[PDB]
């Protein structure tokens, strides 16, 4: 036929190689060092998670005999509630204010894609031309909606304030920062205001507000650095949730200048402007106050999981060891 094949390791199927065999001198250790690493990590996470102080208040008021049921049917649109709670153990360091929504499918396919990221990126062409993605909320009557989509339209518009009920029974207001509650990239990369101009009013010219939004996007915050598409509350909302039960950052309680606890133990009152209706779909609103930890947040699932997986790895090694020895 043709000349001799060339002699190479690849073509002659003689490439250098190792033939790893699952021997008892290799699999048994990794089944024991894993169990010796997963247990201390499981203990370390579990103890740290239980060292996190956190309080979760459910202020939807669906069930009667609660001081917020009046706002389920707010005959007057401005409705307010007052929930009193007591913090037994003083919170320390930075404390984060999250709000929690239950049975609110922010991961729904019809909901996740209902946005125009080009408009949120600050594109002039897409500012006045919402995409078909935000189809049901492209325009209100004649001109397009600036934050178009089911996402921006259904933004969380409740307001939450906390007061310290001190020894005098006079409510002391508690500082709450609204800046730095969103990703750095979201503030500076993913979200931007339309280019040109100096005042946000003219930039969003000829663009309706979302129908469910009470007010437009021009002045979401008094600070120009927190209004428009770069608003912290709006940005946090657009970052949809992976699961129906989720919580989103609302406010930051920074370290108090004094050595005293950031939220000293005592009587607290939750003053909430009930605006978001969730009881139609059996959804639950919540407010969460939690304290920071040097290992992130609180997650007893993982810490317990390593204990289970680490323990099982240790036990599996023993079972494999006995099976090996019998079959040696």
């Amino acid at each position: 036929k043709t000349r001799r094949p060339d002699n190479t390791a690849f073509k002659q199927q003689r490439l250098p190689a190792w033939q790893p065999i699952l021997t008892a001198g290799t699999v048994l250790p990794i089944f024991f060092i894993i169990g010796l690493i997963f247990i201390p990590i499981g203990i370390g996470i579990f103890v740290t998670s239980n060292n996190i102080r956190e309080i979760e208040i459910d202020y939807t008021g669906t069930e009667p005999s609660s001081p917020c049921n009046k706002c389920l049917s707010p005959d007057v649109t401005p409705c307010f509630c007052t929930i009193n709670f007591t913090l037994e153990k003083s919170f320390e360091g930075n404390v984060f204010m999250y709000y929690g929504l239950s049975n609110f499918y922010q991961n729904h396919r019809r909901y996740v894609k209902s946005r125009d990221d080009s408009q949120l990126n600050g594109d002039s062409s897409a500012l006045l031309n919402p995409s078909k993605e935000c189809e049901p909320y492209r325009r209100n009557e004649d001109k397009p909606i600036a934050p178009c989509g089911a996402i921006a339209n259904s933004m969380f518009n409740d307001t939450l304030e906390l007061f310290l009920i001190g020894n005098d029974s006079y409510p002391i207001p508690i500082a709450l920062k609204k800046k730095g509650i969103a990703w750095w990239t979201d503030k500076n990369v993913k979200f931007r205001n339309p280019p040109g101009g100096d005042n946000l009013e003219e930039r969003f010219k000829g663009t309706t507000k979302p129908v469910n939004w009470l007010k437009p996007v021009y002045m979401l915050d008094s600070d120009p650095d927190n209004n428009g598409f770069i608003n912290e509350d709006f940005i946090v909302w657009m970052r949809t949730a992976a699961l129906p039960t989720f919580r989103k950052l609302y406010r930051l309680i920074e370290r108090k200048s004094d050595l005293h606890p950031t939220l000293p133990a005592g009587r607290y009152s939750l003053n909430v402007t009930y605006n978001y209706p969730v009881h139609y779909f059996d959804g639950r609103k919540r407010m969460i106050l939690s304290t920071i930890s040097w290992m992130g947040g609180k997650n007893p699932f993982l810490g317990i999981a390593y204990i289970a997986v680490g323990s099982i790895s240790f036990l599996l090694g023993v079972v494999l060891l006995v099976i090996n020895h019998k079959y040696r």
Partner: protein, 1035 residues
């Protein structure tokens, strides 16, 4: 009934006949594209991928880009279509070459040049020496006495010897001249076209008289004229009615057993896919009824009733769950198949150095079926042997020669040098001339024969009907006794370069029952010698009482027999002057027809050859190919059964059966007479031949057993089934005197009635039908026609290379394919079923759990290379240990590494991996992972983590799957994860992967997916180690 009118192109044009052109190809310039019909329908996966392409076209129900399934489908369909276009266009060239072959035809009054297409039934043609027969013609005349023709039927059977052919007596003396042939008007009413090559029934009507016809007067298409200047005949069957083409089969499409297994197990994935989507679709209708209708945030206008919403996403979930059957599996198998084929091409241990012919993988689709072979059906001559048949030893007078004791052959110029004789004492004795028996021995070999001389270009070539005689005449020629030439009355032979023309007074004929031949030659002085040569048994029946060397020669024959050599006894006589004169008158009176001419000829033949003087015996070696008996033993240890299907004679086939060690002294040989009684007994009622272990049957007896109304059809399947049961309960089966179609019939019989994977190996056109019929077809290289080579899936030169094709290449290709299939499905069921689990937490809305960019690049960039390299480089044991342990071949023969159980076990593994990959991250984010302004457990983090854990888990699994850890294998497994984590780190996703809880979530998921798998992998091997593991452990 057939009807042929010579020199009449318009006799029966008043369709039933066929023009003498052949159409072997399968496609035209237009009907090639409808090849999509074969590709689409036979493989339901292509139809499903076609449905997906259509299903993704409509924007109404769409979740993924359709550009990503059109491009691979074009690649999947395109490459297979391209492969069959090169195969078919090659068949166009061979058809054109045959059709453009030249022949001379009777035009109006003369012989003119014509092509093989222009020949038609009833057409008179003239063929010269060494010219292919263009059609099944009736011999009318020839250039030599009695209208005699010698023809080589090397395509009807694989034998290169000459076949005797005679024409009708009436036509011999009249149609000699071209003038009478042109005006010849003979009407033939013969048999209808058929595949029978040995039988022909018909008659010639001419000169108001009918002459019966036989197969001896009919030259068939696949033959060649030899030892005759020219011959003439009229075409009877043309083009496709010729017996050579009725002895041919269609080029079917060959696909592996694993290919059929994927088909049936891809049907179940379709059932799973529809059932999953229908179940998820129903849940959305229920979910949209309660939670979706009362959810104001989910309002999108265009009020759709919940039933319609459930209907809509059903097609959304087919698209979301489409990689239950991924298009990358079939794109990558083509890469695996092409690479595995090129290892056969590149092998140096299947490279024949002196002919400079390496192995060739002509079909790249069947590589892993080489590891599945149950039966081998092999040609004998050219495949097991070399078609070299030389003179090895001899017992002359009493002493045995050819023992390498103590050649140039320069003392005689005629010696061609082919003979590899080593003994020097014989050459010394010939030249010395100290013993007349030596000269008389080799004289007999060069005179008592039917061989014919060529004397073309000054070369003294010899052509014989019997390969035994041709070797003996060559041997005598090398030893000085050169048979120069022969006319009708005298035979010329050279003795040590001295011309000596002798006159022959009689040539006793050779018959199968006669088992001997003799020639009576008068010497120039006047002495009469009856030089006789025949079989061992018959010769000893006719010995003079004086013979003292009888016992010694019998002992010599036993020595030669033990070497499985072919032996013939040699004898002369000293008939007197008056005694021959009385007999010569008697002999002539016996040549006339009288009544039968058989009893009289046998009677006078018997009396001629009494009281003969022994000279000894010869020893002819029918050379086997190197490493053939080693190959048959090695493949027998692999539980592969080797059947020899040959067009040669029974005696030659049986002799090679013992030389190959297919038959041993332990085996008892069952013949067609014995088989028929056994089969007949079973009808009137595992087979006793289970202990006999040998089966030698003739093509004539195959028809009797195969028997080639509804009740008759019941007996047809019954008799065929019983024969296959008997023939399969035998260590060796040798089918002899079989036509090319009968070879494929035997291969087909095993396929249908045993469901066995069959291999067919052979050389020449005789084997193309069975090479095309078997599951795998091998073509031995060396035939100038290259007909078995160009119709075969693989083609090397030496039979011994079957060892590496099956035990090394076929065994690895089966291991490397089943490993590829089980993992590739695993990595895609784990990938895609995460969407199924997420449906219970997103409203059953068909939202994907991964970013769109991850879904496109999963099987492209992140899990592609490691499984392809493992499918091209994975060896459980080395090639040396592969041949040293043929019992490792039984792994594929029994279908162990790919099954419904093995397949479903990879479904569970993928199902449980998707379950863990979704529910450990779910628990880690149901509890608010790393809460801060930089990680509020968003959807992107959920998508990035499961993808991150998925890529690591599957890429580690392939590492545990790989046993031959080459550097390129190590680089791919680690580089796939490195590439994945390099793409989403600026060369969203980065933010999640910078946080300990996110990484400790991946580590937990990867371990919980892999760490259990190590336990079963280690536990299974320790308790139930495989044969490869034991060799690997003891390596």
């Amino acid at each position: 009934t057939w009807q042929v009118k010579a020199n009449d192109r318009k006799y029966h044009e008043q369709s039933k006949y066929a023009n003498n052109a052949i159409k072997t190809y399968k496609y035209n310039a237009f009907t090639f594209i409808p090849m999509n019909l074969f590709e689409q329908f036979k493989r339901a996966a292509n139809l499903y991928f076609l449905a997906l392409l259509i299903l993704q076209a409509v924007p109404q129900i769409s979740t993924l880009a359709w550009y990503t399934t059109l491009v691979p489908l074009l690649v999947v369909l395109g490459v297979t279509a391209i492969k069959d276009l090169v195969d078919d266009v090659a068949r166009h060239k061979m058809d054109k070459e045959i059709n453009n072959r030249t022949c001379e035809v009777i035009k109006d009054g003369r012989f003119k040049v014509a092509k093989w297409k222009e020949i038609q039934v009833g057409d008179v043609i003239r063929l010269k020496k060494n010219d292919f027969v263009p059609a099944d013609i009736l011999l009318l005349s020839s250039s030599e006495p009695n209208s005699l023709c010698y023809v080589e039927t090397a395509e009807l059977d694989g034998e290169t010897n000459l076949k005797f052919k005679m024409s009708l007596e009436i036509t011999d003396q009249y149609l000699q001249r071209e003038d009478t042939l042109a005006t010849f008007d003979g009407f033939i009413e013969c048999e209808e076209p058929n595949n029978r090559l040995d039988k022909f029934t018909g008659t010639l009507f001419w000169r108001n008289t009918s002459f019966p016809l036989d197969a001896d007067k009919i030259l068939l298409r696949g033959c060649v004229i030899r030892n005759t200047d020219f011959c003439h005949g009229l075409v009877i069957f043309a083009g496709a009615d010729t017996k050579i083409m009725k002895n041919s089969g269609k080029t079917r499409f060959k696909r592996t057993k694993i290919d059929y297994l994927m088909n049936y197990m891809v049907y179940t994935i379709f059932v799973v896919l529809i059932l999953l989507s229908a179940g998820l679709a129903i849940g959305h209708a229920y979910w949209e009824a309660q939670v979706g209708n009362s959810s104001w945030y989910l309002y999108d206008g265009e009020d759709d009733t919940p039933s319609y919403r459930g209907f809509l996403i059903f097609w959304g979930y087919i698209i979301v769950l489409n990689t239950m059957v991924p298009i990358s599996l079939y794109v990558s198998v083509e890469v695996i198949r092409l690479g595995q084929s090129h290892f056969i091409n590149w092998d140096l241990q299947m490279y024949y150095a002196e002919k400079d012919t390496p192995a060739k993988a002509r079909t790249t689709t069947l590589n892993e079926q080489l590891g599945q072979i149950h039966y081998i059906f092999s040609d004998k001559t050219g495949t097991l042997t070399q078609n070299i048949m030389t003179f090895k030893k001899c017992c002359i007078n009493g002493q045995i020669y050819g023992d390498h004791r103590d050649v140039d052959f320069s003392w005689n110029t005629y010696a061609d040098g082919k003979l590899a004789f080593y003994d020097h004492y014989l050459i010394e004795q010939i030249q010395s001339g100290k013993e007349p028996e030596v000269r008389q021995f080799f004289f007999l070999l060069a005179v008592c024969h039917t061989v014919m001389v060529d004397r073309t270009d000054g070369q003294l070539n010899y052509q014989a009907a019997s390969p035994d005689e041709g070797a003996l005449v060559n041997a005598a020629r090398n030893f000085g006794f050169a048979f120069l030439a022969r006319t009708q009355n005298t035979i010329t032979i050279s003795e040590l370069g001295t011309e000596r023309t002798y006159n022959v007074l009689a040539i006793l004929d050779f018959n199968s029952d006669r088992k001997r031949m003799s020639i009576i030659v008068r010497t120039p002085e006047g002495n009469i010698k009856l030089y006789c040569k025949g079989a061992d048994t018959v010769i000893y029946e006719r010995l003079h009482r004086m013979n003292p060397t009888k016992q010694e020669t019998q002992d010599a024959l036993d020595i030669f027999a033990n070497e499985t050599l072919r032996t013939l006894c040699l004898c002369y006589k000293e008939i007197e002057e008056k005694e021959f004169t009385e007999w010569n008158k008697k002999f002539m009176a016996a040549s006339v027809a009288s009544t039968n001419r058989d009893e009289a000829l046998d009677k006078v033949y018997e009396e001629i050859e009494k009281d003969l003087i022994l000279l000894g015996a010869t020893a002819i070696e029918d050379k086997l190919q190197d490493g053939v008996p080693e190959t048959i033993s090695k493949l027998a240890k692999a539980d592969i059964k080797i059947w020899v299907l040959t067009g040669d004679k029974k005696e030659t086939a049986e002799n090679i059966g013992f030389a190959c060690e297919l038959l041993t002294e332990d085996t008892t040989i069952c013949y067609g007479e014995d088989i028929n009684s056994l089969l007949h007994a079973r009808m009137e009622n595992f087979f006793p031949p289970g202990g006999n272990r040998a089966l030698i049957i003739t093509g004539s007896w195959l028809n009797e057993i195969l028997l080639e109304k509804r009740r008759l059809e019941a007996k047809k399947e019954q008799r065929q089934k019983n024969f296959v049961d008997l023939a399969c309960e035998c260590s060796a089966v040798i089918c002899c005197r079989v036509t090319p179609k009968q070879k494929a019939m035997v291969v087909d019989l095993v396929k249908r009635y045993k469901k066995a994977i069959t291999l067919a190996i052979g050389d020449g056109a005789n084997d193309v039908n069975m090479i095309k019929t078997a599951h795998i077809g091998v073509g031995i290289s060396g035939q100038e026609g290259m007909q078995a080579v160009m119709s075969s899936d693989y083609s090397f030169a030496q039979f011994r290379y079957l060892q590496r094709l099956l035990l090394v290449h076929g065994r690895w290709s089966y291991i490397r394919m089943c490993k590829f299939l089980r993992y590739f499905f695993y990595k895609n069921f784990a990938f895609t079923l995460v969407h199924f689990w997420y449906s219970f937490f997103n409203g059953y809305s068909a939202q994907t759990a991964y970013e769109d960019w991850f879904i496109t690049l999963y099987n492209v960039l992140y899990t592609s290379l490691p499984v392809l390299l493992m499918g091209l480089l994975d060896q459980d044991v080395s090639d040396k240990l592969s041949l040293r342990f043929p019992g490792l071949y039984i792994v594929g023969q029994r279908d162990l590494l790919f099954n419904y159980k093995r397949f479903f076990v990879s479904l569970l593994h993928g199902v449980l991996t998707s379950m863990i990959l979704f529910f450990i991250p779910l628990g880690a984010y149901l509890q608010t992972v790393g809460q801060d302004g930089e990680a509020p457990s968003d959807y992107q983090s959920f998508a990035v983590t499961i993808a991150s854990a998925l890529v690591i888990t599957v890429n580690f699994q392939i590492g545990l799957d790989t046993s031959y850890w080459t550097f390129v294998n190590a680089f791919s497994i680690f580089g796939s994860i490195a590439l994945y984590f390099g793409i989403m780190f600026d060369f969203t996703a980065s933010n999640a992967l910078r946080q300990p809880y996110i990484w400790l979530t991946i580590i937990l998921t990867v371990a919980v997916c892999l760490l259990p798998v190590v336990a079963i992998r280690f536990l299974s091997m320790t308790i139930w180690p495989s044969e490869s593991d034991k060799i690997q452990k003891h390596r």
